[PDB]
Design a protein around this nucleic acid. Structure first.
Ligand SMILES: Nc1ncnc2c1ncn2[C@@H]1O[C@@H]2COP(=O)(O)O[C@H]2[C@H]1O
Ligand SMILES: Nc1ncnc2c1ncn2[C@@H]1O[C@@H]2COP(=O)(O)O[C@H]2[C@H]1O
Lengths: 201, 72, 201, 72, 66, 66
DNA sequence: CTAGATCACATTTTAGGAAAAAAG
DNA sequence: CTTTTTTCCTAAAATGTGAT
DNA sequence: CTAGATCACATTTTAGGAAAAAAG
DNA sequence: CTTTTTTCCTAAAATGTGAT
């Protein structure tokens, strides 16, 4: 549709799994769009403890925040969850593109809209729920994601405890615990990195 | 719905895939359609390529896998 | 500038202090813009414990999130911090307005950009810092706000402990504590609702 | 800067205000300009209206209150 | 001390506080400094800004209230 | 039991697992059910899907591995 | 082992508006 | 006379307390 | 008083790629 | 012959542990 047009103006680059697309702190001058693949938005603290802010899959834009105000820094790091193809565009050229057609901007903003909603919910969670609560919630969310696997007893997902730690913001041990706990309570199944959240569907 | 009526073959998928659903007793796209990936994966001789295949054809035909629907 | 144009198409209403502009959960069909006044974006939990998500002053848009996807619910409550004038517009009519001029959309998105950045930082805070840390940080942030008062020893602000509680997400007692603590450490001054964060400027 | 040179009067503000900065020893907009609200509030006979006044004129003239600048 | 000889009046303050001290029988900066904050706050028409004012003059005037 | 008389072969499984049991000297569903999971996993060319397969046939076939 | 939540209530502080009192 | 500043007042809201 | 962080390390699990082995 | 599935293998990463 419009997208074809948009892309035809982007440069395209492949990023190998685990590589860094956006490096928090750098001058934001380009806009990215995920053609194929998945990636992880995350921020670290002084020591370096990471916190997963969000997972973005194909169709998503990345590093959009720099676009509206001239000369800002990337708001957070973005690591390639898997190997993935990415379309890039100078914020400049992109603005030009918008003049000829805001439909595209509409599309972009539309994502930020979503992203705000959720990140906001993220805040309320760290605010109101407890680890069991948050972990509980996330298993639901991860079950939502695309790479989720349809399973007889619900949804199946692969993700480490360390990871869920960085998602919900608690220790990896504590995740293991709350995880065994949820298994007793027969709510999820857990075999290594493979977890199955019953109840989905 | 109209599609789930016609049999799987209409999906024009690879031999391997066919012979697999075939041997797994799948007849109509209405059965397959409501089958879990994890299951199909246990299916002998049905691997990632074949699985990814099934999903993609169902995806084009507008369907999903592990579909939900009562009375079949 | 453009804004004059934009407003000329909005209906205008005055909201008395403490009134509710947006009621989380309701059908989002209108976009708002703050002409005069301040307001507070906040969300509650099951019990009803509120959590201040953000403070928006004049110039800000409100209830923009509903605009891109048809038929969603308001993402959170928005209470009038003070009495304030608000311009309103059907999302419909607003879209039309954008066709004739995306400049306006540009402006709107531009805010969401900002809002995401911060709300994201909000997450990292609940994630990495401790109450003293977060409270520490917020006193800085509140010092930033417009209604802040220039003071010889820095910035002066009026805000209750209960409030800071709902901001940083901890108990009101604990705020009082960490607050006395910061006063001993001679970092801030506190007389009732009036606090002065030294060091600003 | 050029503005902070001329005296406060150029601000064409209300009597009350004037007589107040006046009695508070303020001469050039360069002094006032770098004065804290909280201070001006202690100034007798200078109230919210008058204070809000000062800020607004400085705001139009492009200046702020409690300004910072060395050597004056 | 030599200053405590001088009248409150010679201090020049604010009409309001003036009339207060005045009709309160506080004629010399002595009578004044003899009182504490709480003392005058009870004085009619004398309040926050007033007290705070009366304080700030004796501030740079090397005199407190006690 | 009457089924344990029948050969593994009569069970029909998967070429791979077949040749395994076969060249592993497992001719009757008896010889088979006598072994546990760990037992066959050590069998060359017999692994995860294999074992998992051999299990699922005896699943609806009222037979376990012990 | 540490960092906060807690809980009832007596006590302190605030909002904000009438009205006296200066100022212009 | 009119404005703006100050004082003055109280129902209602905020606060501290401190060991488990 | 409660809810989590902790800490080192022996032990378990995973990624992902060669290559054997079926299938077409 | 060519593809796809399965097994098989290990450096590297994830995990549990449990009283303070
Ligand atoms: N809260 C968030 N949710 C989703 N994506 C985000 C969030 N914060 C940052 N990002 C993305 O990460 C990018 C980091 O650099 P930018 O600020 O250019 O743009 C940012 C967004 O694309
Ligand atoms: N994280 C946030 N930061 C700032 N404003 C927000 C945030 N979340 C919600 N809002 C505002 O609150 C509004 C609630 O309703 P809407 O979803 O229509 O639009 C929302 C935004 O205008």
């Amino acid at each position: 549709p419009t997208l074809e047009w948009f892309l035809s103006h982007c440069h395209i680059h492949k990023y190998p799994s685990k590589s860094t697309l956006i490096h928090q702190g750098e001058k934001a001058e380009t806009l990215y769009y995920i053609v194929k693949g998945s990636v992880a938005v995350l921020i670290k603290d002084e020591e370096g403890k990471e916190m997963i802010l969000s997972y973005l899959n194909q169709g998503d834009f990345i590093g959009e925040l720099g676009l509206f105000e001239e000369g800002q820094e990337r708001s957070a790091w973005v690591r390639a969850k898997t190997a993935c193809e990415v379309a890039e565009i100078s914020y400049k050229k992109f603005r030009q593109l918008i003049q000829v057609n805001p439909d595209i901007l509409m599309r972009l903003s539309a994502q930020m809209a979503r992203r705000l909603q959720v990140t906001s919910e993220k805040v309320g969670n760290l605010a109101f729920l407890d680890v069991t609560g948050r972990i509980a919630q996330t298993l639901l969310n991860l079950a939502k994601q695309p790479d989720a696997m349809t399973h007889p007893d619900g949804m199946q997902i692969k993700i480490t405890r360390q990871e869920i730690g960085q998602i919900v913001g608690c220790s990896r041990e504590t995740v293991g615990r709350i995880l065994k706990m949820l298994e007793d309570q027969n709510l999820i199944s857990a075999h290594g990195k493979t977890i199955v959240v019953y109840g989905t569907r | 719905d109209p599609i789930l009526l016609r049999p799987v073959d209409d999906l024009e998928l690879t031999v391997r895939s066919a012979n697999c659903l075939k041997a797994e007793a799948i007849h109509y796209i209405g059965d397959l359609v409501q089958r879990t990936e994890v299951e199909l994966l246990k299916t002998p001789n049905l691997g990632k390529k074949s699985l990814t295949e099934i999903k993609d054809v169902l995806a084009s035909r507008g369907l999903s896998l592990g579909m939900r629907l009562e009375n079949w």
